[PDB]
Design a protein around this nucleic acid. Structure first.
Ligand code: MG
Ligand code: MG
Ligand code: MG
Ligand code: MG
Ligand code: MG
Ligand code: MG
Ligand code: MG
Ligand code: MG
Ligand code: MG
Ligand code: MG
Ligand code: MG
Ligand code: MG
Ligand code: MG
Ligand code: MG
Ligand code: MG
Ligand code: MG
Ligand code: MG
Ligand code: MG
Ligand code: MG
Ligand code: MG
Ligand code: MG
Ligand code: MG
Ligand code: MG
Ligand code: MG
Ligand code: MG
Ligand code: MG
Ligand code: MG
Ligand code: MG
Ligand code: MG
Ligand code: MG
Ligand code: MG
Ligand code: MG
Ligand code: MG
Ligand code: MG
Ligand code: MG
Ligand code: MG
Ligand code: MG
Ligand code: MG
Ligand code: MG
Ligand code: MG
Ligand code: MG
Ligand code: MG
Ligand code: MG
Ligand code: MG
Ligand code: MG
Ligand code: MG
Ligand code: MG
Ligand code: MG
Ligand code: MG
Ligand code: MG
Ligand code: MG
Ligand code: MG
Ligand code: MG
Ligand code: MG
Ligand code: MG
Ligand code: MG
Ligand code: MG
Ligand code: MG
Ligand code: MG
Ligand code: MG
Ligand code: MG
Ligand code: MG
Ligand code: MG
Ligand code: MG
Ligand code: MG
Ligand code: MG
Ligand code: MG
Ligand code: MG
Ligand code: MG
Ligand code: MG
Ligand code: MG
Ligand code: MG
Ligand code: MG
Ligand code: MG
Ligand code: MG
Ligand code: MG
Ligand code: MG
Ligand code: MG
Ligand code: MG
Ligand code: MG
Ligand code: MG
Ligand code: MG
Ligand code: MG
Ligand code: MG
Ligand code: MG
Ligand code: MG
Ligand code: MG
Ligand code: MG
Ligand code: MG
Ligand code: MG
Ligand code: MG
Ligand code: MG
Ligand code: MG
Lengths: 46, 270
RNA sequence: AGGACCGAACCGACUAAUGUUGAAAAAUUAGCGGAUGACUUGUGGCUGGGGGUGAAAGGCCAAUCAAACCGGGAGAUAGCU
RNA sequence: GCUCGCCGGAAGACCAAGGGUUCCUGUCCAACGUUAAUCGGGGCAGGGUGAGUCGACCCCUAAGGCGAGGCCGAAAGGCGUAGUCGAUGGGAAACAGGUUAAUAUUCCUGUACUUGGUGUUACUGCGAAGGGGGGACGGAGAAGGCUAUGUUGGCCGGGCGACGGUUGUCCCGGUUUAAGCGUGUAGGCUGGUUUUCCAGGCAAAUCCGGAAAAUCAAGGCUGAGGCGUGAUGACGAGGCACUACGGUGCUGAAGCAACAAAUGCCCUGCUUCCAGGAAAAGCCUCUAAGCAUCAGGUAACAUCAAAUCGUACCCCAAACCGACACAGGUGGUCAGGUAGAGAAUACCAAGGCGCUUGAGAGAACUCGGGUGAAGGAACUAGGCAAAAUGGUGCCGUAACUUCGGGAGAAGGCACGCUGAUAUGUAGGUGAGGUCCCUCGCGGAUGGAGCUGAAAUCAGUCGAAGAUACCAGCUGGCUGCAACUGUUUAUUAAAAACACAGCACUGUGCAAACACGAAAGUGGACGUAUACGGUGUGACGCCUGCCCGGUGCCGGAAGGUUAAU
RNA sequence: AAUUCCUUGUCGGGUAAGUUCCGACCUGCACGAAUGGCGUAAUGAUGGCCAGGCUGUCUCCACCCGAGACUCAGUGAAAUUGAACUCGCUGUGAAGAUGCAGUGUACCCGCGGCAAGACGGAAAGACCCCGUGAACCUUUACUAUAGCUUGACACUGAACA
RNA sequence: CUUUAAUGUUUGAUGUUCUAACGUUGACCCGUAAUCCGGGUUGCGGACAGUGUCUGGUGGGUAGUUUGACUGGGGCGGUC
RNA sequence: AUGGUC
RNA sequence: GCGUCCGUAGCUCAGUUGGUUAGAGCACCACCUUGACAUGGUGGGGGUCGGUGGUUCGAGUCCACUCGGACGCACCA
């Protein structure tokens, strides 16, 4: 079939990337809710 | 202007409109630009006026709804199929090399010498403002504020007829049958607009919608009642007064409230 | 010339037999429909939960739909087992 | 190692996606592998990814994102001008041979080609933020000219056959050579050239634009492939000295001709259709600003550049998406034979695999299949399933009709091989031979040679000649819907929805109307022959009565009447 | 008739026979003119019916070749399950017995099958009821709202008549 | 006081000419390489229109809830 | 405006 | 099978309009007209307003139920 995950790096870095988390002020709180619980995979940039 | 011969279901009902006066070639190059298909969605990215989207690549042709150059005569060169509007567009060469696009009147060909301005002689093709036109002669490209651009009466085959020149105002009769006051010094153009049989064109099939960019239209009593008032029924039922999607009555209810323009509307269209 | 015909790629999925802790949480084998058009397809961008999109079945929106997914009020309330 | 089998438009040969040592070389079999297991895509360790030319950045953009100021929202913020990014598209350059256990257009071999400055000698007009030309652009269609490509000849070398025959019109291989560089053919486009003047291109223009006169009759562009050079080089039958069964070094004949032919190329060209087919830059031209001969551009030589980054490997699967080493899915590139209309089909070569459990016996029963005496739908809800028809050519073909259709209506007739017509014809191609010559890649007369249908007539084998594989069951009355389409991904594809057409009605433009508290945007850079809403659903014949309820439209003298 | 209940209405073809089909009648329970009437060439993976061709669909099933199922070798699951030394009957009885009461047959234990029972086993039943339980939906159910428009006041000015 | 109508005024309505408040999704010049915006020059409209406050009407566009029990099982009848 | 039937 | 309009002359009628008192069209013909039939007229009987009660002297009439026809049915698989 045509399954759910169809992978693309140039879409993933623009959707769930760090510079995607950049401009949205409601996303700065998301980064500040991952740093302040201390995860290793902060965002899915590589 | 012939019916197409019934070879197969799909050309059984086609009446074309063909015209051999046109240009079988490429448009004039420095007059194009880009008119991309906006797809019926605004900056918020939502469908606001429905049914639109699809079609063919419509390259805009710039066209001069002002005709500002007084005095200088202007020979016509050829005619072309501007795919934006339902008229045809003449290509005009002035006496000093400037080319332009204008609307095509009814009696136009290759060889006419039109002239724009105040002191133009009276013949179809010419333009001149409406305190020198004589009363009764039917005009197109009528402007509502002096110098804006041709705004009234600009379709395939329309006209407006000047009936009275009193004071510092003129009174028209528009193509939708409503009289109208206009400032006595707006820039109108004599004679009608050429391609007078667009209404004879039956398109023929479904495909001539979605080669023109009109999507399907689902009538009201198809839907389920969260999408339109007319829905429901275990079968067919239309037991409610006929409405829009958004609540309002549609079979007659007037919707004009632009009360800053009612100085000029002399009588409504009946 | 064709929203033409018979027909492989390609797209779709009408009937029957397999199989329903199977090779697959929707497929396989013999047959089927369209197949220069209102088509099919790779890339990118746009729309957003009472809102989006709909050639209209309440369909579909991350294997979830007559109101999605996650966290919070919330240890919601329960004459009922 | 050698018998057998399977795909050969795939399960063969590669890349962009995505994964991230899965790649090669030693060593190990405890878990992993659906079995055994010395083997591995498994465990450990070591090696392996070489660029001026090929891909990313890079100059310029399309959708669209952000957006100094700016406008508008309670703050968050929402849009949006100047600008700034965004590939999926435009922009300079390299082809062949050889080597590694595992990389090559990247290293080596002869040969290239472009883009930058700098420095010389010669002549003088250069300029960017604007101007102009150009980049620059659909769908369908037929021909013509070719090529990759294949076949039979020409030649070179080897073979005389496990049993009948095989010194020959006999058997097998081999016949390959690129980029670049002068030439301007098939074929396509445009008439050139000299001069006066102009309100136009945001100011100037000596190029584009537009009036005007003199002439000159072909000037310029475009461009597939052979043709000359590249190239006395490389490759190549091999004979073959070592020789571990690892391979190594010298050597090395032919290297021509015809015929056929693409979906590739001339082709960004031609004809024609209505639904009328992008941008800015690189590339050229043009000027007033100004530098007044220092800069600055244009020719041969010489110099060095040309940095960084990514290149292994799988990439229709065992490495990606599907929890499985999953009968699932995923976009592009190449296209051999004998039949064949053909990328269908049947067997094949180049190439790859026998799908990680087996050895047996020959029960009921079940899955997948081949055959069948008499009858031939009596089966059942129902001809469900199965069987059957099935191609090319010719004669022929009903009611009904919107003149097209119905129609491949229905039914029939010939078909294998051999010989002759013709020792291979009609046709296609085309070498010599000769003539002028406006000259070159010539133009004609010319017919060698090659290739090769289709038909008629005799003759012959079988039970049967479209023999296998592919390859329509036909006809008779109705119900619904005009039709082609589309949806309930994952139990309903239908009579449901759509549609061309008709009709009401709203809207004169800062339109109605929708997404938005608001700026603004769609509507459209559209203007009533246009747009939105509702309803019916081609076309033919038609669309009648009822304004009392209930909507809606028009009236404003009268009674009831809010805030104030 | 896709609408017709009394109904297989009534007649005629089709069949030996025809509750469906085609053609007429009208006593239409309750068609009907743009939520459209009737009609129609072509078309439909469409609804209904008869005919020729064809045969395992069938009367009536027989044989054959292959992948399983049976045996031996290696790897090796899952649903369930209070416990178990787990027979038939007539009767009793949460009222439809392997056990209770009476009676009669039966040496203990495996593989190959058939599927009647153990109210067999996955799903705290969807059907109706109960819930002063909720979601969506409709309206001339109630109560308020966005939007629409009505007048007063401000931004709001002078003369005028 | 029945109840008029002439000098002056006390205050809201009905209409018209003007413009300085506001309007301009009308042209021209500047910031400017700029159609957004802002500055002035003008033309047209103008005491309207547009907007804030209260009030009348309309308002399933949108929202929250209600709709009883008894009953030889419920709805329908009765009954309270 | 009155004037059907035999 | 809530409840309604309701229930009458040889045919449909009106009359409950919060109560008392009897109203028609059509039409059976004897007679007035026309040569002759009606189109016109006098006329006589024809309603305890289905039935049983009560408020009531005065009710066809203000009503609770019974036979008959139309006017609304939802729930239920
Ligand atoms: Mg529309
Ligand atoms: Mg329509
Ligand atoms: Mg529709
Ligand atoms: Mg529906
Ligand atoms: Mg609604
Ligand atoms: Mg109905
Ligand atoms: Mg109805
Ligand atoms: Mg589909
Ligand atoms: Mg289906
Ligand atoms: Mg299949
Ligand atoms: Mg086809
Ligand atoms: Mg087709
Ligand atoms: Mg929600
Ligand atoms: Mg889903
Ligand atoms: Mg909800
Ligand atoms: Mg709480
Ligand atoms: Mg709880
Ligand atoms: Mg609680
Ligand atoms: Mg094979
Ligand atoms: Mg094939
Ligand atoms: Mg490994
Ligand atoms: Mg190894
Ligand atoms: Mg193992
Ligand atoms: Mg082992
Ligand atoms: Mg390996
Ligand atoms: Mg390994
Ligand atoms: Mg190098
Ligand atoms: Mg490159
Ligand atoms: Mg953009
Ligand atoms: Mg912005
Ligand atoms: Mg800002
Ligand atoms: Mg850029
Ligand atoms: Mg790209
Ligand atoms: Mg690219
Ligand atoms: Mg330029
Ligand atoms: Mg083309
Ligand atoms: Mg060749
Ligand atoms: Mg070749
Ligand atoms: Mg031999
Ligand atoms: Mg021999
Ligand atoms: Mg040979
Ligand atoms: Mg070359
Ligand atoms: Mg490599
Ligand atoms: Mg390799
Ligand atoms: Mg592959
Ligand atoms: Mg796979
Ligand atoms: Mg799975
Ligand atoms: Mg395997
Ligand atoms: Mg296997
Ligand atoms: Mg076996
Ligand atoms: Mg057997
Ligand atoms: Mg058989
Ligand atoms: Mg038989
Ligand atoms: Mg036989
Ligand atoms: Mg039968
Ligand atoms: Mg069948
Ligand atoms: Mg078959
Ligand atoms: Mg259909
Ligand atoms: Mg679709
Ligand atoms: Mg389905
Ligand atoms: Mg706009
Ligand atoms: Mg319809
Ligand atoms: Mg219809
Ligand atoms: Mg009507
Ligand atoms: Mg009326
Ligand atoms: Mg009315
Ligand atoms: Mg009114
Ligand atoms: Mg029927
Ligand atoms: Mg009926
Ligand atoms: Mg019936
Ligand atoms: Mg009968
Ligand atoms: Mg009938
Ligand atoms: Mg109907
Ligand atoms: Mg109607
Ligand atoms: Mg179809
Ligand atoms: Mg029968
Ligand atoms: Mg098997
Ligand atoms: Mg077994
Ligand atoms: Mg075993
Ligand atoms: Mg026991
Ligand atoms: Mg018992
Ligand atoms: Mg028992
Ligand atoms: Mg059982
Ligand atoms: Mg069993
Ligand atoms: Mg049971
Ligand atoms: Mg049970
Ligand atoms: Mg329960
Ligand atoms: Mg509600
Ligand atoms: Mg109850
Ligand atoms: Mg009951
Ligand atoms: Mg009385
Ligand atoms: Mg008489
Ligand atoms: Mg039912």
């Amino acid at each position: 079939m045509k399954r759910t995950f169809q992978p693309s790096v140039l879409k993933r870095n623009r959707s769930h990337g760090f510079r995607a988390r950049m401009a949205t002020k409601n996303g700065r709180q998301v980064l500040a809710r991952r740093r302040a619980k201390g995860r290793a995979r902060l965002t899915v940039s590589k | 202007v012939v019916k197409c011969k019934p070879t197969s279901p799909g050309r059984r009902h086609v009446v074309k409109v063909v015209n051999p006066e046109l240009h079988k070639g490429k448009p004039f190059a420095p007059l194009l630009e880009k008119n991309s298909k906006s797809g019926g969605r605004n900056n918020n990215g939502r469908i606001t006026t429905r049914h639109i989207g699809g079609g063919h690549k419509q390259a805009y042709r710039i066209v001069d709804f002002k005709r500002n150059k007084d005095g200088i005569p202007a020979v016509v060169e050829r005619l072309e199929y501007d795919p934006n509007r339902s008229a045809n567009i003449a290509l005009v060469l002035y006496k000093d090399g400037e080319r332009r696009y204008i609307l095509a009147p009814k009696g136009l060909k290759a060889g006419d010498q039109i002239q724009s301005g105040v002191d133009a002689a009276i013949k179809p093709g010419n333009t001149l403002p409406m305190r020198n036109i004589p009363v009764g002669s039917t005009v197109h490209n009528v402007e509502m504020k002096p110098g804006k651009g041709g705004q009234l009466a600009r379709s395939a085959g329309t006209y407006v007829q000047i009936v009275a020149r009193d004071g510092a105002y003129v009174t028209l009769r528009l193509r939708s049958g409503e009289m109208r006051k206009v400032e006595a010094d707006c820039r109108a153009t004599l004679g009608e607009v050429g391609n007078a049989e667009h209404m004879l064109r039956v398109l023929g099939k479904a495909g001539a919608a979605r080669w023109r960019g009109v999507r399907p239209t689902v009538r009201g009593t198809a839907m389920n009642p969260v999408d339109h008032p007319h829905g429901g029924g275990e079968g067919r039922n239309f037991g409610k007064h006929p409405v829009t999607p958004w609540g309002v009555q549609t079979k007659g209810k007037k919707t004009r409230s632009n009360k800053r323009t009612d100085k000029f509307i002399v009588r409504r269209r009946s």
